[PDB]
């Protein structure tokens, strides 16, 4: 067809933070479509990929991926907490990111 998307779009909002101290080890993700923790409970444990590009070709590609997963819900509005192998570079606040449907329970 014309669409081939097998993931859900999301936005990298910020790190986990207090009013004046942030914590880069936990990122905050807005998954689009979900507006409550009860709907966000479907997406727990799903893999997340941040997909970006670079000028230098490394192993056949100019596209590099950072992997992570959803761990828990955050707040009352469907924001989730996500942890990555290496933390997200904080210039990606507001950048798009992919939530895959695996590991599936359905």
């Amino acid at each position: 067809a014309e669409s081939h998307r097998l993931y859900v779009k999301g936005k990298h909002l910020s790190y986990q933070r207090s009013k004046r101290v942030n914590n880069p080890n936990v990122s905050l993700i807005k998954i689009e479509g979900v507006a409550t923790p009860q709907d966000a409970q479907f997406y727990l444990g799903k893999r997340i990929a941040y997909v970006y590009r670079a000028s230098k070709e490394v192993r056949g590609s100019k596209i590099r991926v950072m992997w992570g997963k959803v761990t828990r819900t955050h707040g009352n509005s469907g924001v989730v907490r996500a942890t990555f192998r290496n933390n997200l570079p904080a210039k990606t606040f507001g950048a798009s990111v992919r939530i895959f449907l695996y590991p599936s329970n359905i």
């Binding site: 067809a1 669409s3 081939h4 998307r5 097998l6 993931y7 859900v8 479509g33 979900v34 709907d39 479907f42 997406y43 449907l101 695996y102 590991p103 599936s104 359905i106």
Partner: protein
């Protein structure tokens, strides 16, 4: 090894006899009967990769005949069950993709 044996059928969408992981599929509610297929031939030793040595490096750049007539035996038994209810051949030939406005936490498969 906790894997699922699946087939396309190969005549429909070109997916051969294969094994997949159960955590990487979505079980839809659409059900066909697979009684009449003799799948006890296949096992974990049926799929062997014949592991490659470290010396054989592919600088620049086939199929088992046993595998291809096994596929031809099973898929002709599946498609007879496919022909009963309408539009299943078209459904299995078409691909799945998420459109704009599809919420997977609300979708039923």
């Amino acid at each position: 090894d906790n894997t699922l044996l699946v087939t396309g059928p190969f005549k429909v969408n070109g997916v051969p006899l294969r094994r997949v992981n159960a955590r990487y599929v979505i079980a839809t509610s659409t059900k066909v009967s697979v009684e009449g297929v003799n799948v006890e031939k296949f096992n974990v030793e049926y799929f062997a990769k014949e592991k490659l040595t470290k010396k054989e490096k592919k600088e620049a750049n086939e199929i088992k005949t046993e595998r291809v007539e096994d596929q031809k035996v099973v898929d002709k038994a599946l498609l007879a069950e496919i022909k009963k209810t309408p539009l299943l051949k078209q459904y299995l030939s078409a691909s799945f993709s998420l459109k704009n406005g599809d919420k997977p936490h609300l979708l039923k498969f």
